[PDB]
Each structure stands twice: as C-alpha cells, then as structure tokens.
Enzyme design. Structure first.
Site, PDB file in Angstrom:
ATOM      1  N   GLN A  22      23.178   4.486  -1.644  1.00 42.30           N
ATOM      2  CA  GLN A  22      23.680   3.566  -2.661  1.00 42.30           C
ATOM      3  C   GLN A  22      22.942   3.744  -3.989  1.00 42.30           C
ATOM      4  OE1 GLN A  22      25.883   0.079  -0.227  1.00 42.30           O
ATOM      5  NE2 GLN A  22      23.773  -0.453  -0.799  1.00 42.30           N
ATOM      6  N   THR A  69      16.412  -8.457   5.696  1.00 40.53           N
ATOM      7  CA  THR A  69      16.557  -9.264   6.904  1.00 40.53           C
ATOM      8  C   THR A  69      15.639  -8.809   8.031  1.00 40.53           C
ATOM      9  OG1 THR A  69      18.920  -8.941   6.393  1.00 40.53           O
ATOM     10  CG2 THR A  69      18.352 -10.563   8.028  1.00 40.53           C
ATOM     11  N   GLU A 119       9.836  -3.604   9.018  1.00 36.07           N
ATOM     12  CA  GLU A 119       9.662  -2.608   7.963  1.00 36.07           C
ATOM     13  C   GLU A 119       8.197  -2.220   7.729  1.00 36.07           C
ATOM     14  OE1 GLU A 119      12.800  -2.972   4.803  1.00 36.07           O
ATOM     15  OE2 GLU A 119      12.713  -5.074   5.336  1.00 36.07           O
ATOM     16  N   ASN A 165      11.144  -3.539  -4.118  1.00 38.10           N
ATOM     17  CA  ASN A 165      12.320  -4.382  -4.348  1.00 38.10           C
ATOM     18  C   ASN A 165      11.917  -5.748  -4.879  1.00 38.10           C
ATOM     19  OD1 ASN A 165      14.486  -2.810  -3.923  1.00 38.10           O
ATOM     20  ND2 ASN A 165      14.952  -3.527  -1.841  1.00 38.10           N
ATOM     21  N   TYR A 175      22.344  -5.900  -4.443  1.00 35.77           N
ATOM     22  CA  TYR A 175      22.006  -4.475  -4.437  1.00 35.77           C
ATOM     23  C   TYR A 175      22.585  -3.757  -5.652  1.00 35.77           C
ATOM     24  CZ  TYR A 175      19.898  -4.697   0.180  1.00 35.77           C
ATOM     25  OH  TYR A 175      19.062  -4.996   1.232  1.00 35.77           O
ATOM     26  N   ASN A 233      20.339  -1.726  -8.020  1.00 32.80           N
ATOM     27  CA  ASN A 233      20.518  -0.279  -8.095  1.00 32.80           C
ATOM     28  C   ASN A 233      20.789   0.198  -9.515  1.00 32.80           C
ATOM     29  OD1 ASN A 233      20.094  -0.305  -5.368  1.00 32.80           O
ATOM     30  ND2 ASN A 233      22.227   0.128  -4.793  1.00 32.80           N
ATOM     31  N   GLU A 251       5.722  20.502 -12.771  1.00 35.65           N
ATOM     32  CA  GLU A 251       4.980  19.827 -13.837  1.00 35.65           C
ATOM     33  C   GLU A 251       4.677  18.368 -13.486  1.00 35.65           C
ATOM     34  OE1 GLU A 251       6.363  22.457 -17.798  1.00 35.65           O
ATOM     35  OE2 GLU A 251       6.653  20.266 -17.757  1.00 35.65           O
TER      36      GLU A 251
END
Ligand code: 7LZ
Ligand code: GTP
Ligand code: ACP
Ligand code: GDP
Ligand code: CA
Ligand code: CA
Ligand code: MG
Ligand code: MG
Lengths: 54, 435, 326, 427
Positions: free
Chosen positions: B14, B178, B182, B205, B223, B227, B253
C-alpha cells in the site's frame, strides 16, 4: 564556515557546509535452516496424528 | 544505473502504491503509462529511467515487484488508477497470509514462495544494463513484512552480492494496530536482516499518526492519510536517484554519507512543512530548516538533543537557494543543541531540487513552494530500539505467544539470539553517543 | 481520575507529594511498572525517559528534566560554566574551579596556584570524601574524578559564635519552564578557625544545636539579624544575587532540556547551595537535583509542588513561590 | 477465506438456526436465499459464510447434525429453514439420552462418517478454507459428546486449519439433567486440546441478563438464544464485513495454547420501557460492555485479570469518541489488565449495525476470571463422582472410571493455570 563541492546541475544544486573539523550465510546454510524448520513442523504433526490414531 | 523496488506485505504494497502514484505525478506519467515529455519512445537512459523501463508502445513501467502472501491487497494494484502500469509477473500473491507470525512468514510460507519471488526479481534484473540494487518496503509487525522480508534479504545477499539494499520499514504503533505480537516480529526481523541491509529508514506510525492529527487536523487518520504523507518522505529521499542531481545519485552514496558503522544504519528522517490543504502562511528556508530539529516533525519520536550526530543531510525541494540554507544553518547552530561525535566533522550535505513537492490532487496535503527532508544519523534513535526491546522483554519473560512461533518450526532459542543481538545494538549506540 | 506511579522509594519529598495526591481522592497509585500512568514520580538514576510519551491517549508528566545533571554533577557544572557562552565571561559568582581526573585541567590548576602562593595570596582549596588544604600536592595525592575549588577564606560569620554557614534555596521548574523560587530557604550552620567540623556545614557533618534548633535558621530570623547586625535586608544584600544566579543557571540550559513541544513533559525541584562572603557577596556552591527539605517545610513545599507542577497539568475538580521571569 | 459452520444437537441447532436468521438478514439474504439488500458492503465478504448457487442464490455453508430428528424438523419448518442445503442435514433416530458416552462413543460413532462426508464436500469447494466453527452445548449428549468427537475427526483430516466453538456451559439454574457436570467436564477436556478459540456462553448469565436487566420475568430458551445470536453476530462482524482471518485473530488473542476460553459481552442491554427508541451514546455502550451485568459467562471480571480484550463497535459513530472511551475505561480498570502484554486492548469499528439498532458493541475477553466457571463445574462434578452417582449410565456404554478421573484432573490443571497468570506480574 566552509562551503565546498558546489555542483550546479540544471535541476538544482548540491554542496557541503562544514562548521567544524573532527577530533555471510551461504545458500546451503539458509536451506539447512528452512528444512530444519520444516522437519520440526512435520515431527509435531506426526505426534498429533499418532496421538489421534490412539 | 537502475533501482528495483520490492514491496512486501500489506504495508509495503500500500505504501508502494502511494509512492508509484506520486512518482507518476512528479514525472508526468499518465495512469495508462504514457509519458508525453519523454520524446525518446521505447528507450533512452534519462534520470527517471532508474525507476521506469519503457515498452515499444511507449509505456513507462515501474521497476517494481509486489509480493504478499494474501491476494486482496495486491488486487488493489491490479484494479487501481495505475493498474495499466504493471504487468502480471510483477504481482505475486499467495493464498493465506502469515497471520502476524514471523515464523510463518519466514519458514513455513517463505520457503515455498521465495524462488518464485527471486525468479520475478531476476526478470527485472535482466532488463538492467547496470543494476544498482534494491529498495525494500515492509512493515516490522506483519508476519509477511517481517518474516518473508528477512528471508528475501538473506537471499538477495546471496544472488546479488555486490548490490546495495535499502529499507523503508514501518515501525509498529498501537494507535493504528490491532496486533499484540509486533514487538516479537520486529526484533526477529531486525536481527535476521541487520547484516543484509545497508541503510534502513524507519517510519514510526505513531509519528505519522500524530503529524496527521496536528498538522492536517484529521480527527482519526486512515492508512490512506498515513501513506500519502509517507510517500512524500520516500519521494524526497529517492528524488536524487530519479532526477538530475549531484547528491545521493546512487544507492551506495546513502551508505557513504549516512553510515560510518555498518550496524548503525538507521537514519532519522524529519520532514517540513506539512500543511493542511483546507487552509496559508508560506514558511522560510530558515523556518523549515529549524523545523527539522523539532521532535514533532520526526518520523520516529525521540530527542536528538540527548544523542550525538554522526552524519546529517538536508534535501530541499522547491524555491531554495544555497545562501538561504547557509544563513539558516548558521543561525540554528548558535541556538539549538547539536553535538556531533568528536570523530566526525560537524557539517551538512545539502541537496536542492528546484521542482517543488508534488501532491495528490484532492488530497489533504497543501502544495507548498519549498520543503525539506533532513536525514540525520543520530544515536537518539536508539530510544526506539529500547521501547521495542522493553515490550518484547515483558511478553517474553512469560513466554506469552511463543507457542505460535515454535509451532511453525522456529526454535525458542531464536528469540534469545535475536534479543541479545538487539541488546548489543543498544550497547553500540551508547558507546557511540554517551560520555 | 488521574493515575501516577512511584519509583523512588527513598524520595523524602515525593513520598509526601504522593500522600497528598492520594488525599485528594482524584489520584490513584498503580504498581511501579504499570505503563498507563499520567504522572511518574521517577527514580534518581537511569530514569527511562525514552519510554515516556508513547502511551495512546495518555498525557504523561515526570518529576525530572532529562539532561539536568549537567547542572547537578559537580564535575559537569564546572565544564558548563567554563564553556557556556552565556556564563563564561559573565560568571563572577562561582569560585574558580578545575576538573581533575585520577579534557583535563591539571596543567591549568597549577598555573593559577603558582600565581597565588607566589603573590603570597590566600591559597586554600577544597577538593570533592572532601579535603580542604593549602598545599597543592596534599590535595592531589587525595584525588589519586574530583573538582578542586577555591575555598572562600573570608566567609560571612554569624555572631555570636563566629560560625560559618550555607544557604539552601528550593527551586521548582514546571513543564512550561517557569522558574518558581520557594519563599522559604534555610541556613545550615557550623566557631570558624582560620578539623573539618567548623569548615563543613552539611547537616550530617554536624550531627550542636544551642544557637538554633537543628543548626538550621530560617529567613524570618536571618533577615532580622542582617537588619540588627548590618543595617541591610536579606532581600537587598543576598536574595537579589540568589535570584540572579538561579536564573542564569536555569536559563542557560533551557534549550537543551525544555519539554515544551516534546511528546512527554517534565518538572523538577532543585536545591541550590550558596555561600556568603564578608562583603555580602553571594557564591553558588553546588546544585542538587534530588533535594530533601527542612523538616518544618515539607508540608508547605510539597503542596506547592502539587499546586504548581502537578495539578497545573492534571487539574482537580496566596502564593508561596516567587516567579523568576524571562 | 471460507468458514465451514457446524451445529450439533438440540442447543447447537437452535442457536445455530437463529444465528443464520440474524446474519442472513444483515447480509440482505431473504428466507429463500435470494439477495435483496442495498449496499455493496453486504456482499463484499459474503462467501466467508455463504456459497453461491446459480441465480445469485446464497446457501449457508452450514452442516446440521443431530442424533434424533426433532430439532432438525423444527429448523426446516422455522423461518429460514428453506435456506439450508437439503443434503447438509445429517441426523439419526436413537438420540443420545443426554449422555456424553452415547454422543462420543456409541450412537455418535455410527453417524460421524456421514457428517465427515458433508464436511469434505463443503471443504473441497472452498477456494481457501480458514477453518471451522461449531455451535453446541456441553451439558447434553449430542452437542457435547458427538460434537467433541467431530472436532477430533476434523482435526485429524484437517490438522492445520482453525477450529473454533461457541459452547453453551451448563448451570444448575437452567438445567435439563443432573449429569450435565459430567458431560461438560468430559467436553472441556476435549476443548482444552482441540480448539483454538472457544466462546463460553453460560446459561446462568444468559438467564440473569434476561431477568435482571431485560426485566423479563419468565425467560425462554427463545430469549436466551436471541441474546446468543446477537452476540454471535457481533463477534463475527470482523469476519463478515470490511475491517482479520481466524488464525490472525487467534494469534493475537491466545497467549498460551490452553487458555483460549473467551468471555463474550453485548450492548446495549436495556428494558423496552419507552427507552428502546432512545439514541444510545458511545459512553453508554462502552460502560455497559465492560460491566459484569453484561457478560455472558457468569464470571466476575473484577475477580481476575484480562490477558487480551477485543471490542467491536457497530454503527455510524465518532471513531474519535470510541478511542476516548476505550482509553477512559482502561484507566478506570488499570488493575484488571496484565501489564506484561503491552497494548492488550484493541478496538474495531464497523458501520453496518445489527437490524433495529443504530449502534451496538460486542466484547470479547480472554480473562482469568473464567477460572470461576470451570471450578464451579469441577465442584459439581466432584460432588457426584466421589459417590459414583449416576455413573452407571456411562460405564454401561463401555467407559471406565479412569476416563472421568483424567478429565477432572485436566480441568483442575486448567484452573491452576488461570490462577498462575492472574498472580503473575512484571516485577
Ligand atoms: C427485551 C428487550 C428487547 C429490546 C431492547 C429494547 C433492546 O433493543 C432496542 O432498544 C431496540 C431494537 C432491537 C432490535 C433487535 C436487536 C431485535 O432482535 C430485538 C428483539 O425483537 C427483542 C427481543 C428478543 C425477542 C429477546 O427476548 C431478547 C432477549 C434479545 C436481545 C438481543 C435484546 C437486548 C436488548 O437490550 C435490545 C437490543
Ligand atoms: N503506515 C502504514 N502501516 C500499515 C499499513 N498496513 C499495515 N500497516 C501496519 O503494519 C503492521 C501490520 O502488518 P501488515 O503489513 O499489515 O502485515 P503483512 O506484512 O501483510 O503480513 P501478514 O498479514 O501477517 O501476512 C501494523 O503495524 C499496521 O499498523 C499501511 O498501509 N500503512
Ligand atoms: N569553595 C568553598 N568555600 C567554602 N566552603 C565550601 C566551599 N565548597 C564547599 N564548602 C563547604 O563544604 C560543604 C559541602 O560542600 P558540597 O555541597 O560541595 O558537598 P556535598 O554535595 O557532599 C554536601 P550537600 O549536597 O548537602 O550540599 C558545604 O556545606 C560548604 O559549607
Ligand atoms: N441457551 C440454550 N441452552 C440450551 C438450549 N437447548 C438446550 N440447552 C442447554 O443445553 C444443555 C442440554 O443439551 P442439549 O443441546 O439439549 O443436548 P443434545 O441435543 O444431546 O446435544 C443444557 O445445558 C440445556 O440448558 C437452547 O436452545 N438454548
Ligand atoms: Ca524515453
Ligand atoms: Ca551533592
Ligand atoms: Mg497482510
Ligand atoms: Mg435437550
């Protein structure tokens, strides 16, 4: 201060501002890990199916 | 010198969608792939060709692969405005996803889809007369974003050993998640990916969410909101590869300018200004540069005043001249707290691209006449590893949720090995940064 | 209602602020590791500042300024005063001090010492586990990180008794970086012999108590004495200088430590230590980041903390502080 | 993607039937399986529970199981009974006499291959099967004994698919036979081992809600089942409407394999005394949802601690207001959430509310308080077993006493497990 490396393209420019000077695993090894994981899953499944057969 | 983008999992796909959409607006590429200003049909090697190849009918095709273990997010691509841009081979979907389980993304399903992905990547590589390397987009918290991405990066080191790999990684925030696992997936993927990434840009986030609430006055960002803002940061970070320029014009670089020590390869990004499109007062070069030292404008909330800079890089888009930057730098250094490590030069690499930022029409971001993205390698970003590491420690001391990973064929020992690697990462930052 | 945690089980002061919070029926104490708190009465050492301000929906306040050690470490205070453009030339209220390790100023210390003894000037220093001595070698053999500071040889001596003293002032800095000087200070008092007892005024280095209860004397009396003894007031002869020193130190580091525009918020209670020489000149000794209080004053001052620093952010359903401006 | 639904025995088929009535309505599927709704949102994820038959007819992916035919006949005659695939009614004639041994070993064994045949045929037509859901009671014989036999055979044929249940627990207050503690204790044993998520619905709590809150003087099974179907509709909204597959839900809700027994809740629960039409605010929904009087396992949440909490709101309401209230209540109940699982309360919103309600909320909690439900069963089980009371009905079906001892020993172990995690701190 000291301004160096001034490049002037046609789309903008760039330069450096100085304010003070200072003072792996092979493919086979990866495969071993993945197949190891697969075998532990398959062992766990076999215990389950054996336990269900009982 | 070509760049191949790789979008892994829901967050990568996304965000990849928002980025390629922005690129097309910036380069004048219509949704159907045609590029009117491109007077060399089906060829040429201009600056934007590092991200787009060309068909014989004049189509401009992103050098991108989208992979997800579940098809519904990639179906967006297949049906979006810019569907006409891609071909099927560039879109790879599985049947069922990793269920936010790193072990499932890396071992169980990864083992089964990696060769297809590598094959599809190989098909873009063979189109490149001088492949630079890869830009890899993924979440830390998804089972796919975390688990498959680390498998992919290991294999990319094997297949493209002499190629650079950059990361854009979404760091997990409870405001817009949710999941509770994580922190596990985040540590597991950082430990396994560390040796294989040259430079990783983390976006928290939480920071994006708060910049959208405050600056754009959106009660509850989606989102899509998050995004679009992320794609502005990505675009200004990658504009040097896509436009005629002299600063950061090839992937190596990035490492040279931002990463003295290989493991400490996570620059802090700070963007300004973010202005609600419904509004406006137009900020100065000094003002937006000053904004780059505001924790509120950073992609990861942390306090740079209480760390040390190793390198620092300023990317301006729009109506900016060098004399303005230098006067603004001079002023801020007498006011702000800024301490480089004593073994680095106190300085800024500056790049100005005259084209002002581009925005999605009808989006929430106002078009401004000048903006800046500051890339600084601060030890202060170690705060984010400490936060993440502590959440991990809390669940892991009770082995909460561990059975889900073991059940996919991972060993409990991999949690410890990953955690101890992160402990060393934190030790590395302290040594570099504290007295 | 509001929630707070407690993580310094040795905080004299915040144990009382914690008890007051509870008495308001609108604060409740969660176990020390519960992350969903509004206020952290945090630990003196290694306070996890980097984990503050990331709990969804929670406004989080802490009672220490990250970075304030720069003023409260004796070694750090010296480097700060020496190298801060805002204080370097301007600092005439801090004794000549040197950093010395067992970025080092061993060679510079000896340079001013030679001037002193050669000029036959007063040349008595105090390194700090303290040691006051007049020979430079006698001090250094003791140090083998300490600071060596010129010992004030002409201190203002209270009479009767001929007794040294020091002045503690309490300073509260709120989340907005207002500077609030508590109306009450204490003297801590010794006869001075030009034996580390009449030379060290610490409340522990004394514990005695015939002149004033607990060797501590409050401002009401010390003012009256200055009036009777010297035809001046506490405000004119000393407090103006104290207010100037507090403002200089705290305004100096404000850009480095302020929590405005930060994702969490700070306040902190400080104890400045001062000396007065016999020309009614005031000298900053040290700055304490974790001060206790005079037994008599705990009540009033801990209520001021809650009023000015805590309830100011988490409101409930005259003034004891002097506001030092900007 | 696809879920296969099974309902077994009297309680399972009655609750199962209402659930399909409710969600068929929500998806605009009329009693003949034709669609007549007004929003793409109804059809977006319709295949999760419905197969598509020629002519835009939607057929529930539901298998109906029982050992006597009564309740099956009543379903076919009920409102949406024509909606079910005729081949998917699987039933016998003997009955199970409220006897777990008969459901699991004697009468049930005979019928189980036929159920597995229908399951196979439904599975084989799935693009990618998520897992199975079983509704049943634990106090009877068919739901309890055959139901857990079914789960065992499904796990053997589909070892890597998710298995969830909605399980009605017995209570003496709403009781059919005295052997219920035996049937439930034997079943919990199975559930501990073979389900990924079990929603515990206690008939005592259902009754008390109808009596004390809904002001219903004499509740019927109809009443209780309406509460259960509304709750089932709530917990599955995140599967049926845009927002969450079964495995990703279990991974984030189940921190230890054996503690996967959930406490559901629903709101609003109000008396129809000229209050029913009153618009309900987000505060009201959230306070109720976390109140004891609103939970459908007779367990005091204040008596234990939450491991994880999922709250689902339905309707058009301020998403901002929702976060403000969910946070407010975590601050209120800070004491009741373990501190060693960061961020363990999570919220979802869906704009399609249930029929007849502007907004609603469903609560799903993994709470150590549930230990109270199991220790009640254990106590009742032990009172009888120590005297071998009513055991002859089971030993006469070939079961030995030792199987009862193992089941009792397994549940008490479960209870001690909840107790450990209730006292565990981050210290
Ligand atoms: C007896 C109270 C009836 C309605 C209330 C005023 C309220 O709804 C309301 O304020 C308004 C509308 C409810 C519409 C739906 C849901 C419909 O299924 C209700 C059903 O017809 C009513 C009663 C059934 C036959 C059962 O006896 C009952 C136990 C089911 C259960 C879901 C009701 C909980 C209430 O809090 C409810 C949601
Ligand atoms: N900023 C942003 N974050 C996202 C987006 N999608 C998911 N996330 C975040 O990513 C994490 C969830 O991981 P996902 O990317 O959805 O998971 P995945 O990689 O698809 O892997 P699985 O679904 O587990 O197979 C959470 O922290 C989400 O907040 C997105 O489009 N933008
Ligand atoms: N330069 C100086 N001239 C004269 N006396 C001094 C001095 N420096 C320190 N002293 C005396 O020594 C005592 C202790 O000083 P200092 O505060 O540096 O040590 P300390 O931190 O261990 C005690 P506290 O924290 O309570 O103030 C003071 O109370 C003061 O009387
Ligand atoms: N809530 C509810 N409970 C029921 C219903 N029917 C039976 N029960 C309960 O379920 C248990 C009896 O199981 P039952 O389903 O009748 O036996 P089975 O047909 O052999 O599976 C007892 O606890 C009854 O109270 C019903 O329709 N609703
Ligand atoms: Ca061209
Ligand atoms: Ca001290
Ligand atoms: Mg996904
Ligand atoms: Mg019955």
């Amino acid at each position: 201060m000291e301004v160096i490396e001034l490049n002037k393209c046609t789309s903008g420019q760039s330069f450096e501002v100085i304010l003070k000077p200072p003072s792996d695993p092979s493919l086979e090894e990866i495969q071993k890990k993945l197949e190891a994981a697969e075998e532990r899953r398959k062992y766990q499944e076999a215990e389950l199916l054996k336990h269900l057969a009982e | 010198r070509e760049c191949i983008s790789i979008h892994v999992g829901q967050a990568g796909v996304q965000i990849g969608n928002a980025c390629w959409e922005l690129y097309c607006l910036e380069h004048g590429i219509q949704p159907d792939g045609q590029m009117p200003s491109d007077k060399t049909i089906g060829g040429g090697d201009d600056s934007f060709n590092t991200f787009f190849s060309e068909t014989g009918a004049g189509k401009h095709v992103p050098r991108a692969v989208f992979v997800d273990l579940e098809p519904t997010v990639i179906d967006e691509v297949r049906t979006g405005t810019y569907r006409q841009l891609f071909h099927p081979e560039q879109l790879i979907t599985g049947k069922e996803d990793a269920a936010n389980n790193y072990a499932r993304g890396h071992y169980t399903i990864g083992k089964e889809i990696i060769d297809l992905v590598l094959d599809r990547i190989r098909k873009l590589a063979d189109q490149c007369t001088g492949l630079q390397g890869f830009l890899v987009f993924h979440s830390f918290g998804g089972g796919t974003g975390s688990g498959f991405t680390s498998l992919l990066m290991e294999r990319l080191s094997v297949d493209y050993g002499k190629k650079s790999k950059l990361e854009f990684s979404i760091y997990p925030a409870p405001q817009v998640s949710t999941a509770v696992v994580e922190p596990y997936n985040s540590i597991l993927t950082t430990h396994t990916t560390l040796e294989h990434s040259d430079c990783a840009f983390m976006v928290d986030n939480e920071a994006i969410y708060d910049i959208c609430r405050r600056n754009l006055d959106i009660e509850r960002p989606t989102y899509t909101n998050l995004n679009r803002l992320i794609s502005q940061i990505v675009s200004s970070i990658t504009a040097s590869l896509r436009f005629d320029g002299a600063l950061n014009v090839d992937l190596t670089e990035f490492q040279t300018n931002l990463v003295p020590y290989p493991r400490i390869h996570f620059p802090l990004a700070t963007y300004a200004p973010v202005i609600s499109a419904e509004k406006h007062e137009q900020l100065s070069v000094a003002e937006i540069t000053n904004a780059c030292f505001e924790p509120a404008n950073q992609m990861v909330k942390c306090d740079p005043r209480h760390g040390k800079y190793m390198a620092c890089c300023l990317l301006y888009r729009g109506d900016v001249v060098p004399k303005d930057v230098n006067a603004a730098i001079a002023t801020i250094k007498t006011k702000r707290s800024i301490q480089f490590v004593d073994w680095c030069p106190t300085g800024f690499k500056v790049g100005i691209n005259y084209q002002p930022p581009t925005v999605v029409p009808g989006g929430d971001l106002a078009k401004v006449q000048r903006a800046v993205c500051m890339l600084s390698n601060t030890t202060a970003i170690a705060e984010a590893w400490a936060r993440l590491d502590h959440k991990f420690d809390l669940m892991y001391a009770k082995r909460a949720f561990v059975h889900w990973y073991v059940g996919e064929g991972m060993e409990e020992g991999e949690f410890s090995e990953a955690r101890e690697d992160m402990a060393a990462l934190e030790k590395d930052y302290e040594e570099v940064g504290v007295d | 209602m509001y929630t707070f945690v407690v993580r310094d089980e040795n905080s004299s002061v915040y144990a009382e602020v914690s008890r007051l919070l509870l008495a308001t029926g609108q604060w409740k104490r969660l176990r020390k590791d519960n992350p969903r708190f509004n206020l952290m009465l945090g630990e003196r050492n290694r306070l996890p500042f980097g984990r503050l301000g990331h709990e969804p929906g929670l406004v989080q306040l802490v009672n220490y300024y990250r970075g304030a050690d720069k003023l409260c470490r004796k070694a750090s205070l010296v480097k700060l005063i020496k190298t801060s453009p805002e204080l370097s030339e301007s600092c005439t209220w801090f004794p000549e001090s040197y950093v010395i390790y067992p970025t080092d100023e061993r060679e510079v210390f000896l340079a001013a010492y030679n001037r002193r003894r050669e000029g036959r000037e007063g040349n008595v220093w105090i390194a700090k586990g303290i040691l006051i001595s007049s020979e430079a070698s006698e001090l250094l053999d003791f140090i083998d990180v300490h600071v060596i500071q010129k010992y004030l040889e002409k201190p203002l001596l209270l009479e009767p008794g001929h007794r040294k003293f020091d002045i503690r002032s309490w300073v509260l800095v709120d989340h907005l970086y207002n500077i609030y000087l508590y109306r009450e200070g204490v003297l801590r008092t010794s006869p001075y012999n030009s034996d580390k007892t009449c030379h060290l005024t610490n409340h522990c280095i004394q514990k005695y108590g015939r002149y004033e209860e607990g060797n501590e004397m409050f401002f009401e009396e010390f003012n009256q004495y200055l009036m009777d003894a010297l035809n001046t007031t506490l405000e004119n002869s000393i407090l103006l200088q104290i207010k100037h020193i507090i403002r200089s130190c705290l305004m100096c580091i404000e850009p480095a430590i302020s929590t405005k525009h930060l994702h969490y918020q700070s306040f902190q209670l400080f104890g400045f230590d001062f000396m007065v020489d016999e020309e009614l000149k005031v000298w900053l000794i040290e700055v304490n980041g974790a001060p206790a209080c005079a037994q008599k004053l705990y009540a009033e001052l801990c209520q001021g903390i809650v009023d000015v620093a805590i309830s100011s952010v988490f409101p409930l359903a005259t003034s004891i502080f002097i506001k030092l401006h900007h | 993607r696809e879920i296969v639904h099974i309902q077994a025995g009297q309680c399972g088929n009655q609750i199962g039937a209402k659930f399909w009535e409710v969600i068929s309505d929500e998806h605009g599927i009329d009693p003949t399986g034709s669609y007549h709704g007004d929003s793409d949102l109804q059809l977006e994820r319709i295949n999760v529970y419905y197969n598509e038959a020629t002519g835009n007819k939607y057929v529930p992916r539901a298998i109906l199981v029982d050992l006597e035919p009564g309740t099956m006949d009543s379903v076919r005659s009920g409102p949406f009974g024509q909606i079910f695939r005729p081949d998917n009614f699987v039933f016998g004639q003997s009955g199970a006499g409220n006897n777990w041994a008969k459901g699991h070993y004697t009468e049930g064994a005979e019928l189980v291959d036929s159920v597995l045949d229908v399951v196979r045929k439904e599975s084989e037509s799935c693009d990618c099967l998520q897992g199975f859901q079983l509704t049943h009671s634990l106090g009877g014989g068919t739901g309890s004994g055959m139901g857990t036999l079914l789960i065992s055979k499904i796990r053997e044929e589909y070892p890597d698919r998710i298995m969830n249940t909605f399980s009605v627990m017995p209570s003496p207050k709403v009781s059919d036979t005295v052997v219920e503690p035996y049937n439930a204790t034997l079943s919990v044993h199975q559930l501990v081992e073979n389900t990924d998520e079990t929603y515990c619905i206690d008939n005592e709590a259902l009754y008390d809600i109808c009596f004390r809150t809904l002001k219903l003087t004499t509740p019927t099974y109809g009443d209780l089942n309406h509460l259960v179907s509304a709750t089932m509709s709530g917990v599955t909204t995140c599967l049926r409407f845009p927002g969450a597959d079964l495995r990703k839900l279990a991974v984030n809700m189940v921190p230890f394999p054996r503690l996967h027994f959930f406490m559901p809740g629903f709101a609003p629960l109000t008396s129809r005394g000229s209050q029913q039409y009153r618009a309900l605010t987000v505060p009201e929904l959230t306070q109720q949802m976390f109140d004891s009087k609103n939970m459908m396992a007779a367990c005091d949440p204040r008596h234990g601690r939450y491991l994880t909490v999922a709250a689902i709101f339905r309707g058009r309401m301020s998403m901002k207001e929702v976060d403000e209230q969910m946070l407010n209540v975590q601050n209120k109940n800070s004491s009741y959430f373990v501190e060693w699982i960061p961020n363990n309360v999570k919220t979802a919103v869906c704009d399609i509310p249930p029929r007849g309600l502007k907004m609603s909320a469903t609560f799903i909690g993994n709470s150590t308080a549930i230990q109270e439900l199991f220790k009640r069963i254990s106590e009742q089980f032990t009172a009888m077993f120590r005297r071998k009371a009513f055991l002859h009905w089971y030993t006469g079906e070939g079961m030995d006493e030792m199987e009862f001892t193992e089941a009792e020993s397994n549940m008490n172990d479960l209870v001690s497990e909840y107790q450990q995690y209730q006292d565990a701190t981050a210290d």
